[model samples]
Target: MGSATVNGPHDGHDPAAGAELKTGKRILYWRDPMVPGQRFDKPGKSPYMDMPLIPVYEEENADGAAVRIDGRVTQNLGVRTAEVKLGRLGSTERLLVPSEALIRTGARTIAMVAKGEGGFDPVEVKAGATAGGQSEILEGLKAGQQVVVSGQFLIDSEASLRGTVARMQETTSGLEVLFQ
Candidate 1:
């Protein structure tokens, strides 16, 4: 009797295993999945077997700073975007004046209006109402006019003294008459 001859299933057959599978992720390195603790710099047929090397993806949290999540997951969780803006609290048409602008001394009310070229002139104004540390100017002032609302006491006192001196000169000729 002649010896029996047998052929194995994978006898001299190539599996065509060098074709790499595409994964749409950043690959940190390529490695053979079947082999442990072994890595490859590029994708090619694994030396140990007739199989393509698998890719090792770069993880999103590799830097330990941020996390990666699916966009559809975020949408399902009701994530939304909000914008910030600046707006006024309320609107008003009445002309509001700072309370500091009104210099009230006994009977007269004065406000220092700014003139051009570093000049300030004191104007006698009529005040109407007050609210929230602000007074309403009923007369002797206009809108968009700059007023000296701070450090105006000294300027007003000097102006009042000059006016009193001029009045004294006009009322009497001799200085002794002012004492009476």
Candidate 2:
């Protein structure tokens, strides 16, 4: 259900037709705001809705593994990002993120990093002192990276689910040995 479906014609309406109109950003695909998982090679009306398909620019997407949410969905979820910065809390310089950005589980603390476009990647971080509104990042994040401050728990949950699915696939053969 999470997989993307790509299809449609490449006629004059190719999504890249307006590449030169923007900042030379190519359209990776066109998708319905309501049904983002399905992609179209060209621009046209959405099969699922009464609206036209929206172009997903290549420049907006980063090159890496991350949970990709649709822009519209992120907007609706009120997702927000804050820059990781080097700041002096009192005695020493430290990496900091808005304390609200940290997701604390019993086993670990996580930060949802904005990976451009609508991608949010969960990074396990070591949290240190908490003062004012910011928390010192002792490890796992660097200055200048953007971390999600709002609507991050949902993204983190999605990342966790993907990780679990990947682990299950990798251990399929090993799991069979345990049953015997």
Candidate 3:
């Protein structure tokens, strides 16, 4: 079957339509995220969720080479600008997360930590001293962990848009459980 053309992330309705999907890039198949393991050789609606089916692209590499990204494109994606670093504890038993890594949304100071290869999860922590290059983490994070030093706000924004940030913090006691 022929591959469907992809334009951008979403388009209000179908989301998957238009061009640039022909960047000479290879397409694997499309899958409805909320459905079972069903795939479509074309783009369109899914049988399970109301959302459009998402495209699964073939990884461009086989030699395990580091993926190189274009700068302007990175800026457009708002990704390459972010930093991830490690910190060791010292006099205060605190860890540094590069002041830039800290996300202070007024009521909370949390950090987005990467999980697996693509999931970056957020956790609330008690922030201590704000020094030269790092923000001391007093609680919520261990001495060693990967934190998103940049582009995290965008991730947080997406979570907010999807109404997931609240879900991430909601306790089971607050609601009647349906999927136990």
Candidate 4:
């Protein structure tokens, strides 16, 4: 009533003084709620007016899906959760690798296997359907092996550099033999 203005005051002597401006049944568009005439392509702040735009919906469906939140339930307790490990429900021998353990270097999918107390080695593994925060290992790993779930990138980069150098050394040695 404050923003929705009427043209004139209603009086008994007035002709058609009680007439009301009719907007279409459905919301034609969103207008600056602060102002009557300003409309927008999407809902946001008014361009010129310092007020939020209101949505005018023509039809109301009372039975549509609804979401309700409880402030009391949320205030008393904090929810703790864990990443779901994906695999057959009862299988004990299937290989399931934590998602954090996988490293994809654009060209290969790699994982780090712990060799000893302070040593880890990189192993290229074949992965199947990735889901539920776990990677299904198809090859290159076995049961009872420890894998690096964190700090995989640092180790993988070191492994990649060493492997590249080994390849170059082989190429240079072969070239020397051929030139000789």
Q: Please write out the lDDT profile of model 1 over residues 36-113, one tens digit for every residue.
A: 698565567899999977756543322122122111111111111111111112443344566656678776677766
By lDDT, is 1 or 4 better?
A: 1
Question: Per-candidate RMSD vs. true structure?
Answer: 37.2, 16.1, 17.0, 27.9
User: How high is each candidate's TM-score?
Assistant: 0.30, 0.42, 0.37, 0.31
Give the whole-model CA lDDT for all candidates, comma-separated.
Answer: 0.42, 0.54, 0.46, 0.42
Question: Model 1: residues >4 Å from true position, as ranges?
Answer: 1-94, 151-180
Model 3 misplacement above 4 A: 1-77, 80-90, 151-180
- Rank order (by TM-score, best first): 2, 3, 4, 1
Q: Candidate 4: minimum summed lDDT over ten consecutive residues — where?
A: 71-80
**lDDT tens per residue, model 4, 24-134:** 132334576457776566555778876766766533221121111110111111111111122453444345666556666675677666543324567887665464656
- Lowest summed lDDT across 10 adjacent residues in model 2 is found at 14-23
- Residue 168, model 3: lDDT of 37
Indicate which candidate wins on TM-score.
Answer: 2
Candidate 4 or 2, higher lDDT: 2
At residue 6, give the lDDT of candidate 3.
35
TM-score of 3: 0.37
Candidate 3, residues 1-180, lDDT tens digits: the string is 764533333322211112121122434346876765875755567766667777655543211122221101112222212223223423565665566666888866888764434346788977767756567776767632456653222122332222222343332234565555
Off by over 4 Å in 2: 1-77, 151-180
